[PDB]
Design an enzyme around this catalytic site. Structure first.
Site, PDB file in Angstrom:
ATOM      1  N   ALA A   1       0.780  -1.243   0.000  1.00 37.65           N
ATOM      2  CA  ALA A   1       0.000   0.000   0.000  1.00 37.65           C
ATOM      3  C   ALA A   1       0.826   1.316   0.000  1.00 37.65           C
ATOM      4  O   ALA A   1       0.248   2.419   0.130  1.00 37.65           O
ATOM      5  CB  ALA A   1      -0.949  -0.017   1.192  1.00 37.65           C
TER       6      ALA A   1
ATOM      7  N   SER B   1      -0.492  -2.210  12.539  1.00 32.55           N
ATOM      8  CA  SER B   1       0.003  -0.858  12.803  1.00 32.55           C
ATOM      9  C   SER B   1      -1.078   0.126  12.476  1.00 32.55           C
ATOM     10  O   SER B   1      -1.929  -0.137  11.645  1.00 32.55           O
ATOM     11  CB  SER B   1       1.242  -0.523  11.954  1.00 32.55           C
ATOM     12  OG  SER B   1       0.972  -0.557  10.557  1.00 32.55           O
TER      13      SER B   1
ATOM     14  N   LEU C   1     -13.673 -13.217  25.447  1.00 26.52           N
ATOM     15  CA  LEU C   1     -13.670 -11.909  24.783  1.00 26.52           C
ATOM     16  C   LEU C   1     -14.731 -10.894  25.228  1.00 26.52           C
ATOM     17  O   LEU C   1     -14.450  -9.698  25.311  1.00 26.52           O
ATOM     18  CB  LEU C   1     -13.778 -12.103  23.274  1.00 26.52           C
ATOM     19  CG  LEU C   1     -12.622 -12.800  22.568  1.00 26.52           C
ATOM     20  CD1 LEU C   1     -12.829 -12.658  21.068  1.00 26.52           C
ATOM     21  CD2 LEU C   1     -11.268 -12.248  23.011  1.00 26.52           C
TER      22      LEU C   1
ATOM     23  N   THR D   1      -1.206  -0.820   4.718  1.00 25.97           N
ATOM     24  CA  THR D   1      -1.917  -2.072   4.924  1.00 25.97           C
ATOM     25  C   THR D   1      -2.441  -2.113   6.370  1.00 25.97           C
ATOM     26  O   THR D   1      -3.650  -2.174   6.602  1.00 25.97           O
ATOM     27  CB  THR D   1      -1.001  -3.256   4.632  1.00 25.97           C
ATOM     28  OG1 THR D   1      -0.493  -3.140   3.297  1.00 25.97           O
ATOM     29  CG2 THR D   1      -1.742  -4.595   4.794  1.00 25.97           C
TER      30      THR D   1
ATOM     31  N   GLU E   1     -15.904 -10.626  28.169  1.00 24.00           N
ATOM     32  CA  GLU E   1     -15.540 -10.174  29.506  1.00 24.00           C
ATOM     33  C   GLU E   1     -14.549  -8.994  29.483  1.00 24.00           C
ATOM     34  O   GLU E   1     -14.618  -8.113  30.356  1.00 24.00           O
ATOM     35  CB  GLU E   1     -14.990 -11.339  30.322  1.00 24.00           C
ATOM     36  CG  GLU E   1     -15.491 -11.374  31.750  1.00 24.00           C
ATOM     37  CD  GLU E   1     -14.813 -12.462  32.560  1.00 24.00           C
ATOM     38  OE1 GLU E   1     -14.905 -13.643  32.151  1.00 24.00           O
ATOM     39  OE2 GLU E   1     -14.184 -12.123  33.592  1.00 24.00           O
TER      40      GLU E   1
HETATM   41  N1  LIG Z   1       6.442  -2.530  17.169  1.00 15.30           N
HETATM   42  C1  LIG Z   1       6.606  -2.709  15.836  1.00 15.30           C
HETATM   43  N2  LIG Z   1       6.266  -1.704  14.995  1.00 15.30           N
HETATM   44  C2  LIG Z   1       6.415  -1.866  13.658  1.00 15.30           C
HETATM   45  C3  LIG Z   1       6.937  -3.121  13.114  1.00 15.30           C
HETATM   46  N3  LIG Z   1       6.979  -3.001  11.780  1.00 15.30           N
HETATM   47  C4  LIG Z   1       6.519  -1.769  11.490  1.00 15.30           C
HETATM   48  N4  LIG Z   1       6.199  -1.109  12.606  1.00 15.30           N
HETATM   49  C5  LIG Z   1       5.656   0.246  12.670  1.00 15.30           C
HETATM   50  O1  LIG Z   1       4.546   0.276  11.781  1.00 15.30           O
HETATM   51  C6  LIG Z   1       4.534   1.535  11.097  1.00 15.30           C
HETATM   52  C7  LIG Z   1       4.626   1.270   9.593  1.00 15.30           C
HETATM   53  O2  LIG Z   1       3.623   0.349   9.187  1.00 15.30           O
HETATM   54  P1  LIG Z   1       3.895  -1.171   8.694  1.00 15.30           P
HETATM   55  O3  LIG Z   1       3.092  -2.134   9.538  1.00 15.30           O
HETATM   56  O4  LIG Z   1       5.356  -1.447   8.452  1.00 15.30           O
HETATM   57  O5  LIG Z   1       3.192  -1.014   7.245  1.00 15.30           O
HETATM   58  P2  LIG Z   1       2.312  -2.097   6.465  1.00 15.30           P
HETATM   59  O6  LIG Z   1       1.093  -2.358   7.314  1.00 15.30           O
HETATM   60  O7  LIG Z   1       3.214  -3.227   6.072  1.00 15.30           O
HETATM   61  O8  LIG Z   1       1.765  -1.206   5.222  1.00 15.30           O
HETATM   62  P3  LIG Z   1       2.492  -0.887   3.789  1.00 15.30           P
HETATM   63  O9  LIG Z   1       3.900  -1.446   3.801  1.00 15.30           O
HETATM   64  O10 LIG Z   1       2.268   0.607   3.821  1.00 15.30           O
HETATM   65  O11 LIG Z   1       1.663  -1.616   2.774  1.00 15.30           O
HETATM   66  C8  LIG Z   1       5.711   2.334  11.660  1.00 15.30           C
HETATM   67  O12 LIG Z   1       5.303   3.211  12.719  1.00 15.30           O
HETATM   68  C9  LIG Z   1       6.648   1.280  12.185  1.00 15.30           C
HETATM   69  O13 LIG Z   1       7.529   1.768  13.209  1.00 15.30           O
HETATM   70  C10 LIG Z   1       7.270  -4.167  14.092  1.00 15.30           C
HETATM   71  O14 LIG Z   1       7.718  -5.258  13.689  1.00 15.30           O
HETATM   72  N5  LIG Z   1       7.083  -3.887  15.401  1.00 15.30           N
END
Ligand SMILES: Nc1nc2c(ncn2[C@@H]2O[C@H](COP(=O)(O)OP(=O)(O)OP(=O)(O)O)[C@@H](O)[C@H]2O)c(=O)[nH]1
Ligand SMILES: Nc1ncnc2c1ncn2[C@@H]1O[C@H](COP(=O)(O)OP(=O)(O)CP(=O)(O)O)[C@@H](O)[C@H]1O
Ligand SMILES: Nc1nc2c(ncn2[C@@H]2O[C@H](COP(=O)(O)OP(=O)(O)O)[C@@H](O)[C@H]2O)c(=O)[nH]1
Ligand SMILES: COc1ccc2c(c1)NC(=O)CN2c1nc(Cl)nc2ncccc12
Ligand SMILES: [Ca+2]
Ligand SMILES: [Ca+2]
Ligand SMILES: [Ca+2]
Ligand SMILES: [Cl-]
Ligand SMILES: [Mg+2]
Ligand SMILES: [Mg+2]
Ligand SMILES: [Mg+2]
Ligand SMILES: [Mg+2]
Lengths: 58, 356, 439, 428
Positions: free
Chosen positions: C99, C140, C252, C145, C254
């Site tokens: 995305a 996230s 869930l 995504t 609860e």
């Molecule tokens: N805690 C944690 N945060 C993460 C991780 N991977 C990504 N993030 C956070 O997630 C945000 C970015 O979104 P992602 O989940 O990487 O993106 P995606 O859902 O794969 O979406 P697209 O790549 O845009 O298609 C940022 O704030 C990152 O710091 C992880 O493994 N752990």
């Protein structure tokens, strides 16, 4: 003053509730509405793309 | 280079702290809404405390303690003193007070008022809102029938409080005063009392019965300059400083300022700020707070000090700005953000640890 | 016994899911191949762990899990990693292009072309459930995504499973580890569209976990592996009651009953203690009082905020290890005298407590030391609205100039959705203001 | 999102394009026959982004080499890495374009463009997932400028949902082939504003000034200038080519760098600045890299960044170094110079790190800035343009190929609108 309540025990643990004071006083849209929103957005995309391809034809 | 932002244009104190910081050549001022600051000199209302301390690579500090308004609104000051066991209902240095609305205490206020109706000894009170402070919205009265009707004639919440019928009176004048003490609480919760206070003097002889002489009874600076014909007689600006008030106490009453008054002031200051410490401290928090307060005291005939008000956004007296503001920088700002490269501190530290 | 299906969306969701299932397996004595020796009912059962694992004829214990990403690289590491055998290929769903950090691209453009596949794979697991209870959605806020697809998925799950509960574990964006400048837009778009579809959501601010990993694990520059192992410990604490025997938070529904009296205010604050470095040679083990007191320090929260300047609607303490009620009650009594724990006037000032005697399991070779007792506090406090105020202010700054807005409009989204979404957040901030503050 | 299709057009396009393939082929362990003789596995994990894999596990650049003259492309075959390129991807005419945009875009170039597009299609069809396109060209000649922009227009028609990226060399009187360059550049800028997602503005003025003032070269050749270009190109494509915590692509770059669609012209920077056959014995410290990469003397576009504001910034550190020290330094720059980063895009500087340094350096940093000060580049070209255009000087070279004065007036206007648009976000 701490009342201990609904104590439940078992082999792996226990749970309970503790009260320190009582209470001081006293649309999910359909499959169709979702489809007619994703499809609407896709039309706006196709429109924007056709406008670009009109401009490139000119 | 450290950075700061200024979000209260009307603050005389922090206007001068801004000047002093720029003049070091190691502090740059940024725009109001640039988030990449070390120091926020903040607005009085809705200071966005929730945005502080989330900028990586910046230690952030602010000149207000979130939650300090529990001390600095009259209604909430009274709730704090009545409900906290550190400062009981029997607390000996706060005037007997009751909160009253147009929660409420009207029927408990009357229950102590009826001890005085069966009393031969003193029923004068005062009524005030927490911030209708233009010199107005203050009624003195010998009975509640004029108060409770007056409280509903104005919109907001009010406090009814004992009026100190027998205050100490400076001579020559037979006249009233209050004491302003400036207290700086730093990021480590050190309580620093500024050595210079000031008496806000009345210049009109005291009392009649038909009280209405907001001049002899109310010692606010704005009220003296407008309504008092005798403004500036004995001391300029109606402001007596400590050297003169000490000297008077030595000549007239054979005591010092320290013994007769300041011990009680230091006691009150310390008891107030140690009460609220667990609610406001920034000791283990992601941003840090300091704050300047203005404590306002009355002294009675017996040389007993009473706490009137605590101001969370005080102005200084004009002579003292230079010294106090330089002290705020040294103690509150440079302690967190040190500069490069015979001191006697302008503050007295309030700590006291008695064992029992 | 009632089954729960876990759904991991985007990079964040998938990698946190990995960490959680790794941990779950170690907790239940399930090996990487899916074999569980201690399970003596071969081929089935209705034990508490069967909430999260189905069983096959050959004695394989298979997560009730769906992994969804719009690009294949992260789920390919699951397909090829230590737990490759654990999952069935149909659980691991990937697209070809992601995305691009754009909510609108995840929701409208690329979402429309994969949504019917994912629901079919979700339906396959739901058909193996005797009493499906609902869903745990990991994602996230900031990803295209994570934000865009999740909100679409959540809308559909309400249509296809209207009586089931839906819980979120949501990573809130932190600039120190984020790769995108548009995460505030994405976060607000997905919160707006997901809000009515989520019964309870646990936010984790990467800022908080990052700094916990700095101060308490002595890690200079925390990786996602560091963050995710800590998050999984916390997720495990929250879910323990569904995978183990007990009488608190057993279902869930609860979570909602115990943590969410006001439906839109459904963001409980997690606080967790103790977090102790495995490299620390001499560690003085912490008592019930010390760890319970630790639950009221902002430095231990999943979101940095100040609970002293808000009000509580609920508080749950979830202990693991050597803990008995007496110690808990003595700790709570001591804590109420020293700290500012103001509840709302229409709720009881109280704590629901759950204790499981198995101490926390740590991943061998990880950064966390074993400890004899730990606790996770779940408190629904109005102080968590500070995070919304931070996020909304960032959104206001960008959106005032319409910066980056063309990227969303170009995917077929309308500009009004920004202001509509931002308005819902203004209402949300005001709801928290009403509940939590006096004049 | 993996495959990128590279196109190089005209003399400048093919000279920098060749140097780019030389430099990244050595960074990915690939030799002039296309055989991998490297040691690290990181040099191949995303080799497919730029290379096709053929029989015998040969690596073949996904590269199309275009010109209206055969000269420079025969020099590319003769050059050191000339045998690497797929021979079917050499697409060339005979007439040349005579430094004339009109010939490149409307007459000579139209005749050759369809055969270039056939080769593009042939490369695109083989792509598991095509990200889009990168073009190397100058804006001051005729082929790279005129035909390169014609190609960009055609490619957008046929692949409207793919990313278009250019490395566009801007003309300067200090390194000048002909007087009509400001015409060719102005006509090209219009095209780039409508039809690219991101453009690296590589200013021959800046490359000269760096060669003269900083590298102490009294007489800079095109080779000295292209040493700076090839180092910058390597740098800015690092995160497309190498695995790290940020596995970037052209769209994500576009989404995060471009807040308004027309303002997609970037100012690249590089540190440390080296001349060919350098005496780089002292590896830079992370503070030095960071201070230099943001220095105007290290900018490849002759603009003073202190005259504008940074909308967004991307920074690539290369070599083995402290990621903590990099974060600190990067945070120090922003916190110490915060007025130059627009407050209305929070956290607008992002940083990546790659362990593999470029050849000849232990540590390097590459800067990619979207600054409003780039308007200085465009004003400069616009002033040069107007000086001639107000007297219609040299226009007959263009009217001869069917162009009308009106087309010049529109191009001048669009470029001045672009300048006003940058100015709108400098004040805000
Ligand atoms: N805690 C944690 N945060 C993460 C991780 N991977 C990504 N993030 C956070 O997630 C945000 C970015 O979104 P992602 O989940 O990487 O993106 P995606 O859902 O794969 O979406 P697209 O790549 O845009 O298609 C940022 O704030 C990152 O710091 C992880 O493994 N752990
Ligand atoms: N309980 C009491 N008994 C007698 N006099 C009192 C009193 N409370 C207040 N006063 C008089 O009223 C004055 C202060 O009124 P108030 O506390 O409303 O201050 P204010 O808010 O109007 C201005 P500031 O905040 O700077 O003090 C004092 O100067 C004092 O002389
Ligand atoms: N930096 C650089 N600029 C070049 C090079 N060759 C030509 N130029 C510049 O490109 C412009 C001339 O365009 P050129 O590429 O020769 O024309 P074309 O072959 O018709 O595209 C002028 O502005 C030259 O200064 C080169 O190798 N490097
Ligand atoms: C807000 O600024 C940016 C700027 C640039 C990016 C991102 C945010 N987030 C990405 O996924 C893509 N991207 C990058 N893309 C590439 Cl190709 N190289 C990069 N190098 C170094 C740093 C970021 C890089
Ligand atoms: Ca079983
Ligand atoms: Ca529902
Ligand atoms: Ca011909
Ligand atoms: Cl249902
Ligand atoms: Mg006041
Ligand atoms: Mg007063
Ligand atoms: Mg992703
Ligand atoms: Mg030439």
């Amino acid at each position: 003053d701490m009342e201990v309540i609904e104590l439940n025990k078992c082999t792996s643990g226990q749970s309970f509730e503790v009260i320190l004071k009582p209470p001081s006083f006293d649309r999910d849209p359909s499959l169709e509405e979702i489809q007619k929103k994703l499809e609407a957005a896709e039309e706006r995309r196709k429109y924007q793309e056709a406008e670009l391809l009109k401009h490139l034809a000119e | 280079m450290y950075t700061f932002v200024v979000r209260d244009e009307n603050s005389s104190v922090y206007a001068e702290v801004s000047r002093l910081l720029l003049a070091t050549g190691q502090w740059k001022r940024l725009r109001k809404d640039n988030p990449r600051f070390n120091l926020m000199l903040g607005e009085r209302n809705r200071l966005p405390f929730g945005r502080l301390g989330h900028e990586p690579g910046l230690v952030q500090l602010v000149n207000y303690y979130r939650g300090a308004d529990k001390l600095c609104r009259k209604a909430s000051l009274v709730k704090l003193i009545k409900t906290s066991p550190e400062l009981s209902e029997s607390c000996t240095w706060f005037p007997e007070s009751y909160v009253i609305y147009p929660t409420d205490e009207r029927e408990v206020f009357l229950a102590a008022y009826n001890r005085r109706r069966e009393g031969r000894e003193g029923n004068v009170w005062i009524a005030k809102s927490s911030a209708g402070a233009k010199g107005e919205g203050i009624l003195i009265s010998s009975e509640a029938s004029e108060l409770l009707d007056f409280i509903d004639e104005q919109g907001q919440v009010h406090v009814i409080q004992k009026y100190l019928e027998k205050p100490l009176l400076l001579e020559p004048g037979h006249r009233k005063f209050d004491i302003r003490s400036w207290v700086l609480v730093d990021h480590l919760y050190n309580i620093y009392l500024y050595r210079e206070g000031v008496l806000r003097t009345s210049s009109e002889p005291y009392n009649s019965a038909n009280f209405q002489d907001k001049t002899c009874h109310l010692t606010n600076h704005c009220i003296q300059k407008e309504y008092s014909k005798n403004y500036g007689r004995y001391e300029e600006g109606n402001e007596m400083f400590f050297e003169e008030f000490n000297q008077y106490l030595m000549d007239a009453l054979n005591t010092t300022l320290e013994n007769s008054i300041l011990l009680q002031i230091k006691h009150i200051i310390r008891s107030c700020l140690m009460c609220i410490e667990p609610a406001i401290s920034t000791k283990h928090l992601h941003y840090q707070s300091f704050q300047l307060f203005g404590f306002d005291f009355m002294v009675d005939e017996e040389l007993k000090v009473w706490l009137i008000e605590v101001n969370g956004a005080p102005a200084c007296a004009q002579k003292l700005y230079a010294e106090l503001c330089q002290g705020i920088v040294d103690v509150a700002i440079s302690s967190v953000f040190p500069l490069a490269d015979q001191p006697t501190s302008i503050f007295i530290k309030l700590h006291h640890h008695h064992h029992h | 016994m009632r089954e729960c299906i876990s759904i991991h969306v985007g990079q964040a969701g998938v990698q946190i899911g990995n960490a959680c299932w790794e941990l779950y397996c170690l907790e239940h004595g399930i090996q990487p191949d899916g074999q569980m020796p201690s399970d003596k009912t071969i081929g089935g059962g209705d034990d508490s762990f069967n909430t999260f694992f189905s069983e096959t004829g050959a004695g394989k214990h298979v997560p009730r899990a769906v992994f969804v990403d719009l690009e294949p690289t992260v789920i390919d590491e699951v397909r090829t990693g230590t737990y490759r055998q654990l999952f069935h290929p149909e659980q691991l769903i990937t697209g070809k292009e992601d995305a691009a950090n754009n909510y609108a691209r995840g929701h409208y453009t690329i979402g429309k072309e994969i949504i019917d596949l994912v629901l079919d794979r979700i339906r396959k697991l739901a058909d193996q459930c005797t009493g499906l209870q609902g869903f745990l959605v990991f994602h996230s806020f900031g990803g295209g995504t994570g934000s865009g697809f999740t909100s679409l998925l959540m809308e559909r799950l309400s249509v296809d499973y209207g009586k089931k509960s839906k819980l979120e574990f949501s990573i809130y964006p932190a600039p120190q580890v984020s790769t995108a400048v548009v995460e505030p837009y994405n976060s607000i778009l997905t919160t707006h569209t997901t809000l009515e579809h989520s019964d309870c959501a646990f936010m984790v601010d990467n800022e908080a976990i990052y700094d916990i990993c700095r101060r308490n694990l002595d890690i200079e520059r925390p990786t996602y592996t560091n963050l995710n192992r800590l998050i999984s410990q916390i997720v495990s604490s929250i879910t323990a009651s569904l995978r183990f025997d007990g009488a608190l938070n057993v279902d869930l529904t609860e979570f909602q009953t115990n943590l969410v009296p006001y439906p839109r205010i459904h963001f409980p604050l997690a606080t967790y203690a103790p977090v102790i470095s495995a490299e620390k040679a001499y560690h003085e083990q912490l008592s019930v009082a010390e760890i319970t007191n630790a639950c009221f320090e902002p430095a231990n929260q999943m979101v940095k905020c100040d609970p002293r300047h808000g009000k509580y609607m609920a508080c749950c303490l979830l202990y693991r290890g050597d803990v008995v009620p007496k110690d808990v009650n003595a700790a709570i009594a001591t804590i109420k005298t020293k700290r500012s724990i103001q509840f709302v006037d229409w709720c009881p000032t109280g704590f629901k407590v759950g204790i499981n005697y198995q101490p926390p399991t740590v991943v061998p070779g990880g950064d966390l030391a074993k400890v004899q007792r730990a606790v996770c506090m779940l408190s629904n406090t109005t102080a968590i609205a500070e995070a919304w105020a931070r996020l909304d202010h960032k959104f206001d700054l960008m959106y005032a100039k319409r910066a980056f807005v063309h990227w969303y409009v170009g995917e077929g989204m309308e500009e009004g959705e920004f202001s509509e979404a931002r308005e819902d957040m203004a209402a949300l901030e005001k709801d928290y203001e009403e509940v939590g503050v006096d004049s | 999102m993996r495959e990128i299709v590279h196109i190089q057009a005209g003399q400048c396009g093919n000279q920098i394009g060749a140097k780019f393939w030389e430099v990244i082929s050595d960074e990915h362990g690939i030799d002039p026959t296309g055989s991998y003789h490297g040691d690290s596995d990181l040099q191949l994990e995303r080799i497919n982004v730029y290379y096709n894999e053929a029989t015998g596990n040969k690596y073949v650049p996904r590269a199309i080499l275009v010109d209206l003259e055969p000269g420079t492309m025969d020099s590319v075959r003769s050059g050191p890495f000339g045998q690497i390129f797929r021979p079917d991807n050499f697409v060339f005419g005979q007439s040349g374009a005579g430094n004339n945009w009109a010939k490149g875009h409307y007459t000579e170039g139209a005749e050759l463009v369809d055969s270039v597009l056939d080769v593009v299609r042939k490369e695109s069809e083989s792509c598991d997932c095509l990200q889009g396109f990168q073009l190397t060209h100058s804006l001051g000649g005729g082929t790279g400028s005129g035909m390169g922009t014609l190609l960009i227009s055609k490619i957008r028609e046929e692949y409207p949902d793919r990313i278009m990226n250019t490395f566009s060399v801007m003309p300067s009187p200090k390194v000048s082939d002909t007087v009509v360059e400001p015409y060719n550049a102005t006509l090209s800028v219009h095209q780039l504003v409508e039809n690219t997602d991101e453009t690296y503005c590589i200013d021959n003025e800046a490359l000269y000034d760096i060669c003269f003032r900083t590298l102490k070269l009294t007489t800079p050749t095109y080779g000295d200038l292209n040493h700076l270009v090839s180092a910058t190109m390597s740098g800015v494509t690092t995160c497309l080519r190498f695995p790290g915590q940020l596995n970037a692509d052209l769209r994500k770059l576009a989404v995060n760098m471009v807040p308004f669609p027309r303002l997609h012209f970037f100012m690249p920077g590089f540190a440390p600045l080296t001349s060919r056959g350098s005496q780089q014995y002292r590896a830079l410290t992370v503070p030095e890299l960071t201070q230099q990469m943001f220095d105007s003397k290290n900018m490849m576009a002759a603009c003073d960044p202190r005259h504008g504001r940074y909308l967004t910034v991307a920074a690539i550190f290369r070599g083995r170094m402290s990621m903590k020290e990099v974060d600190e330094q990067m945070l120090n720059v922003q916190n110490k110079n915060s007025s130059y980063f627009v407050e209305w895009i929070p956290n607008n500087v992002k940083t990546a790190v790659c362990d593999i340094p470029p050849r000849g350096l232990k540590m390097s940093a590459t800067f990619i800035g979207n600054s409003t000060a780039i308007q200085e580049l465009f004003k400069r070209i616009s002033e040069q343009f107007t000086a001639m255009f107000r007297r219609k000087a040299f226009l007959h070279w263009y009217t001869g190929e069917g162009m009308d004065e009106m087309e010049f007036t529109e191009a001048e206007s669009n470029m001045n609108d672009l300048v006003s648009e940058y100015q709108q976000y400098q004040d805000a």
